[PDB]
C-alpha cells in the first residue's frame, strides 16, 4: 500500500486512489438506506429535537440501531454488523442531512464507541459492544475540561484506587460532553494519583456521577451538551481502558478517526448546501427572472461546487487509504483492534488535512448559501440558516483548525527522522533540478503539471524553513501554518486531478466534462494560494540576494499559461442549476 504523507514526494497514480466512482452496489445501498431513514424518520422530528426533546433522539437512535446504523464499525463477533470503512463513511455523509443529530450519532459510533472497539480487552468488548452496536446503550466521550481544551493532556480530573483496591475513585468535571443527557456509557480520561493520564469506561449509573444543565449553544442545538460531574465517582478497577498512564495513545488514535469522520460529515453538508441553494436560485425571481440567470449567483454556485468536489475527492481518498491498509489484516488482527487503529494512524496527516479542508469548504458553502437566499438566509424558517449556525463549531471540533495546521509540518519531519519518508534525500534532488531548470497534450496536462510543481514548492519552502530555524521551527507558527496550507491545497488538488483522470480512463472525456471543469478551476485558484503562501514564507525566512534567488526559483516553479475561469464557472453552474444538486 501507499505510505502516509508520501503524496508529497511520490508520483501517485490513479490506481493508488480510491474515489466515489469506486463505490460498490453495497456502498450505494447502505447510502440509500441511511438517506431514507434520515429523510423519512428523522427530519419530520428535527424541529422538536432542536427544542431538546431528547426522548425523540433516543427513540430515533434505537430505530437507527435496528437498521444496523449504529453497529457498522463494530465486528460481528461483538454484536456489530462489521461493514467496511467506506460504508461507515457513507453513513456519516448521509447523517449530515440531520444537522446536530449527525453529531449525536457520530459521537455515539465514533469517539464514544471506538475506544472500546479499538482498545477494549476481550471482557470489555463482549460486555459493552453488543449493547452499543444496537443503541441499547448509548455512548459519549469525555476528555475536555474547563482548564484543558486544546491542551487535552492537562486534564485535572483525578483517579485513586480505594482502600479495598476494587474501584477507582474519580473526581473532577468534564466539559461540553456530547450525548450527556442520555448516554449510558462515558469514556472518561483522568490522572491516576493525579499523575498518570488514563482512560476509563464509566457508566452513568455508577455512584457519584451526574451532569450539569444543557449548554445554550449557537448551533447544533439538538445535540445534548453538558458537563459531566464526578464526585467520588466509583469505577470498577476492570473498567480501566488500556494501560495506566497511556491514555494519550487512545486519545491520539481516536482523534485521527474523529478528524476524517468530521471531514466526511462536512462534505455531506456542503453537498446539501449546494442543492438547496441551486433549488432556491431557480425559484426566486428578481428583476423578472430567476436569480439563477445572474452571473454572480452562477459564480457563487460554481465556487461552492468546485470546492465540494475537491473536498469529496480528498476525503474518500483518505477513507480509501485506510481501507487498503485494512485489506492486509487477518480476522484475528481486525478483532483485536490495535491493527485497525494503526491502519488509520498511518494516515494522520491526511486526516488532519481533511478535517481542516472540509470544515473550511463547508464554512464557505453555507456562507454563500445564505447570501444566495438573501434575507431568507437569516430566517430560522429556512434550512440554510440552521446549517450556517451548525457549521461554525466544526472549525473548533476535533482539534481547532489552528492546532490541526500546526501539527502537519512536524508530522512530516518526524516521519523523515524515523525513515518512513525520504524527505532529506528528496529535498536534495530538487536543489539540483532548480539549478538545471512546455506542458503536454493529454486532458488535465496543465493540472498535473501544477500538482507536480506544488509538491516541489512545498518541499522547497518546508526544507528552507527547517534548515533556517532547526529544532526551534515549532515556535514559528505563522510559517508552520503556511506550509500546512500548502500541503492541504496540494492534497486537495492532486485528489481532484487523479479522480478526474481515473474517471476519464474509465468512462471517457465526454461524460466527465463537469469533473474536468471543477478540476481546472479549483487547481488554478488553489495553486495561486500555494504561490502566495510560499512567497510569504520565503520573505520571512531569507533576505537580500539569497531571497531574490529563492523567489526566482519560485517564479520558475510557478510560471504557466493561466486559464480564463469565468466562462468555465458559468458552464459548471449551468449543470448544477439543471440538476438542482451537486453533480459530478
Least distance from C-beta 429 to its own copies, angstroms? 29
* Joined grid coordinates for residue 63: 430505530
Q: Segment contacting ligand FAD (CB under 6 A): 72-80, 373-381, 419-427, 498-506?
A: 373-381
Partner touching 476 among ligand FAD, its own copies, none, CB below 5 to 8 Å by kind: its own copies
For 287, 297, 304, 529, the CA distances from 294, given in Å and listed in that order, are: 10, 5, 16, 27
From 234, 175, 174, 163, select the one nearest 201 (Cα to Cα): 234
Q: Are 34 and 522 in contact (CB under 8 A)?
A: no
Q: Tell me the per-residue interface mask from 398 to 417 with its own copies, x by CB under 8 A, - otherwise.
A: --xxx---x-----------
Known binding-site residues equal 141, 143-144, 150, 178, 284, 371, 375, 400, 402, 477
CB contact at 8 A, 74 and 365: no
* Member of 475, 510, 545, 559 binding its own copies (CB under 8 A): 475
Select the residue interacting with ligand FAD from 372, 450, 481, 498 (CB under 6 A). Answer: 372
Please identify, among the stretches 5-13, 39-47, 228-236, 396-404, the one whose residues bind ligand FAD according to the rule CB under 6 A. Answer: 396-404
**End-to-end Cα separation, the chain, in angstroms:** 27
**Residue 528 partner contact from its own copies, ligand FAD, none using kind-dependent CB cut-offs of 5 to 8 Å:** its own copies
471 binds its own copies (CB under 8 A): no
Q: How many CB atoms lie within 10 A of CB 448?
A: 20
Say which of 145, 173, 398, 494 is annotated catalytic: 398
107 binds, among ligand FAD, its own copies, none (CB under 5 to 8 A by kind): ligand FAD
Per the listing, cell 480512463 goes with 505
CA angle 21, 253, 419 (to 5 degrees): 85
Neighbouring C-beta atoms of residue 156, cutoff 10 Å: 14
All three cell numbers of 520:
481546472
Q: Least distance to ligand FAD from the beta carbon of 293, Å? A: 9
Q: Yes or no: say if 21 and 86 are a contact pair by the CB < 8 Å rule.
A: no
Q: Name every residue whose Cβ is closer than 8 Å to that of residue 141 and which is 6 or more positions away in sequence.
A: 107, 111, 112, 115, 177, 178, 186, 187, 254
Closest approach of ligand FAD to the CB of residue 214, in Å: 11
Contact string (CB under 8 A) for its own copies, positions 197-236, x = contact: ------------------xxxxx-----------------
Distance CA 352, CA 333 (A): 25
List the beta bridge partners of residue 290.
Answer: 285
Angle at 149 between CA 400 and CA 273, to 5 degrees: 35
**Segment 150-179, which members bind its own copies (CB under 8 A)?**
150-151, 154, 175-176
In the complex with its own copies, the residue whose CB is nearer, 167 or 191, is: 191
Choice from 44, 375, 419, 544 touching ligand FAD (CB under 6 A): 375
Residue owning grid cell 460554481: 302
The dihedral over CA atoms of 483, 484, 489, 493, expressed in degrees to the nearest 10, equals 100
Instruction: Indicate the SS3 state at residue 12.
Output: coil
178 is in the binding site of which of its own copies, ligand FAD, none (Cβ under 5 to 8 A by kind)? Answer: ligand FAD
CB 280 within 8 A of CB 583: no
Q: List the chain gaps (C–N > 2.5 A) by preceding residue.
A: 437
Indicate which of its own copies, ligand FAD, none lies near residue 143 (CB less than 5 to 8 Å, by partner kind): ligand FAD
- Show binding-site residues for FAD: 141, 143-144, 150, 178, 284, 371, 375, 400, 402, 477
With CB under 6 A as the contact rule, the residue among 294, 364, 449, 469 that binds ligand FAD is 294
Runs of H (alpha helix) within 381-444: 383-391, 401-417, 423-436
> Can you tell me whether residue 110 is helix, strand or coil?
helix
| Residue given cell 478551476 in the structure block | 521
Q: Read off the C-alpha cell for 238.
A: 476492570
Among 291, 306, 416, 504, binds ligand FAD (CB under 6 A): 291
Q: Which of 44, 165, 213, 375 binds its own copies (CB under 8 A)?
A: 375
Phi-psi region of 23 (alpha: psi -120 to 50; beta: other; left: phi over 0): beta
Judged by CB, which is closer to ligand FAD: 71, or 377? 377
Q: Which does 273 bind (CB under 5 to 8 A by kind): its own copies, ligand FAD, none?
A: none
Radius of gyration for the alpha carbons in the chain, expressed in angstroms and rounded: 24
Interaction of residue 402 with ligand FAD, rule CB under 6 A: yes
Scan residues 267-326 and list those touching its own copies (CB under 8 A).
285-288, 294-296, 299
With contact defined as beta carbons under 8 Å apart, do 1 and 324 qualify?
A: yes
**Contact between 549 and its own copies per CB under 8 A:** no
Q: How far is the CB of 74 from ligand FAD (least distance, A)?
A: 19
For residues 430 and 385, give the distance between their C-alpha atoms in angstroms, rounded to a whole number. Answer: 48
**Is 398 among the residues known to form the active site?**
yes
**Binding residues vs its own copies (CB under 8 A):** 144, 147-151, 154, 175-176, 215-219, 285-288, 294-296, 299, 370-371, 374-375, 377-381, 385, 388-389, 392-393, 395-396, 400-402, 406, 475-479, 481, 528, 532, 535-536, 539-540, 543, 562-566, 569
**Binding residues vs ligand FAD (CB under 6 A):** 107, 140-144, 149-150, 176-178, 217, 225, 284, 286-287, 291, 294, 296-297, 371-372, 374-375, 378, 393, 396-397, 400, 402-403, 406, 477
Residues marked active site are found at 398
Amino acid at each position: 500500500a501507499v505510505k502516509g504523507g508520501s503524496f508529497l514526494v511520490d508520483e501517485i497514480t490513479i490506481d493508488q486512489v480510491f474515489t466515489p466512482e469506486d463505490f460498490s452496489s453495497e456502498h450505494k445501498m447502505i447510502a440509500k438506506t441511511t438517506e431514507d431513514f434520515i429523510v423519512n424518520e428523522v427530519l419530520p422530528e428535527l424541529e422538536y429535537l432542536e427544542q431538546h426533546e431528547f426522548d425523540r433522539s433516543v427513540r430515533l437512535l434505537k430505530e437507527a440501531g435496528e437498521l444496523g446504523l449504529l453497529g457498522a464499525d463494530v465486528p460481528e463477533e461483538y454484536g456489530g454488523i462489521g461493514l467496511d470503512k467506506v460504508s461507515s463513511a457513507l453513513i456519516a455523509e448521509k447523517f449530515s442531512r440531520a444537522g446536530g443529530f449527525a453529531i449525536t450519532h457520530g459521537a455515539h459510533v465514533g469517539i464514544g464507541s471506538l475506544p472500546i472497539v479499538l482498545f477494549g480487552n476481550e471482557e470489555q468488548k463482549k460486555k459493552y459492544l453488543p449493547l452499543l452496536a444496537t443503541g441499547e446503550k448509548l455512548a459519549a466521550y469525555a476528555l475536555t475540561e474547563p482548564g484543558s481544551g486544546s491542551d487535552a493532556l492537562g486534564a485535572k480530573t483525578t483517579a485513586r484506587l480505594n482502600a479495598e483496591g476494587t474501584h477507582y475513585v474519580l473526581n473532577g468535571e468534564k466539559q461540553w460532553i456530547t450525548n450527556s443527557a442520555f448516554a449510558d456509557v462515558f469514556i472518561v480520561y483522568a490522572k491516576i494519583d493525579g499523575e498518570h493520564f488514563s482512560a476509563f469506561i464509566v457508566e452513568k449509573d455508577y455512584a457519584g456521577v451526574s451532569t450539569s444543565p444543557e449548554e445554550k449553544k449557537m448551533g447544533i442545538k439538538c445535540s445534548s451538551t453538558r458537563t459531566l460531574i464526578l464526585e467520588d465517582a466509583l469505577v470498577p478497577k476492570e473498567n480501566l481502558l488500556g494501560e495506566i498512564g497511556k491514555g494519550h495513545i487512545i486519545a491520539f488514535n481516536i482523534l485521527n478517526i474523529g478528524r476524517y469522520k468530521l471531514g466526511v460529515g462536512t462534505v455531506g453538508s456542503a453537498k446539501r448546501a449546494v442543492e438547496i441553494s441551486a433549488q432556491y436560485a431557480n425559484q426566486r425571481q428578481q428583476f423578472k427572472q430567476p436569480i439563477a440567470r445572474f452571473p454572480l449567483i452562477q459564480e457563487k454556485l460554481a465556487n461552492m461546487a468546485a470546492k465540494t468536489y475537491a473536498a469529496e475527492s480528498s476525503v474518500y481518498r483518505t477513507v480509501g487509504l485506510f481501507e487498503s491498509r485494512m485489506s492486509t489484516l487477518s480476522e484475528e488482527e481486525v478483532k483485536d483492534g490495535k491493527a485497525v487503529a494503526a491502519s488509520i494512524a498511518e494516515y494522520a496527516i491526511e486526516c488532519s488535512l481533511n478535517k481542516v479542508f472540509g470544515s473550511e469548504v463547508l464554512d464557505y458553502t453555507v456562507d454563500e448559501g445564505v447570501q444566495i437566499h438573501g434575507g431568507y438566509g437569516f430566517m430560522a424558517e429556512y434550512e440554510i440558516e440552521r446549517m450556517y449556525r451548525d457549521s461554525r463549531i466544526n472549525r473548533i471540533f476535533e482539534g481547532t483548525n489552528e492546532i490541526n495546521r500546526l501539527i502537519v509540518p512536524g508530522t512530516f519531519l518526524r516521519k523523515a527522522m524515523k525513515g518512513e519518508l525520504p524527505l532529506l534525500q528528496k529535498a536534495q534532488k530538487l536543489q539540483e533540478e532548480l539549478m538545471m531548470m512546455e506542458v503536454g497534450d493529454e486532458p488535465l496536462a496543465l493540472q498535473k503539471y501544477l500538482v507536480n510543481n506544488a509538491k516541489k514548492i512545498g518541499l522547497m519552502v518546508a526544507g528552507l524553513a527547517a534548515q533556517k530555524y532547526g529544532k526551534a521551527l515549532d515556535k514559528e507558527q505563522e510559517i508552520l501554518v503556511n506550509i500546512a496550507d500548502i500541503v492541504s491545497n496540494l492534497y486537495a488538488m492532486e485528489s481532484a486531478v487523479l479522480r478526474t483522470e481515473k474517471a476519464i480512463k474509465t468512462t471517457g472525456l465526454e461524460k466527465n466534462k463537469q469533473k474536468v471543469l471543477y478540476t481546472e478551476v479549483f487547481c488554478q485558484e488553489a495553486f495561486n494560494e500555494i504561490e502566495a503562501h510560499a512567497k510569504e514564507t520565503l520573505i520571512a525566512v531569507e533576505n537580500g540576494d539569497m531571497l531574490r534567488m529563492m523567489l526566482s526559483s519560485l517564479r520558475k516553479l510557478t510560471r504557466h499559461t493561466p486559464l480564463n475561469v469565468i466562462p468555465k464557472k458559468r458552464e459548471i453552474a449551468a449543470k448544477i442549476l439543471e440538476d438542482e444538486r451537486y453533480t459530478v
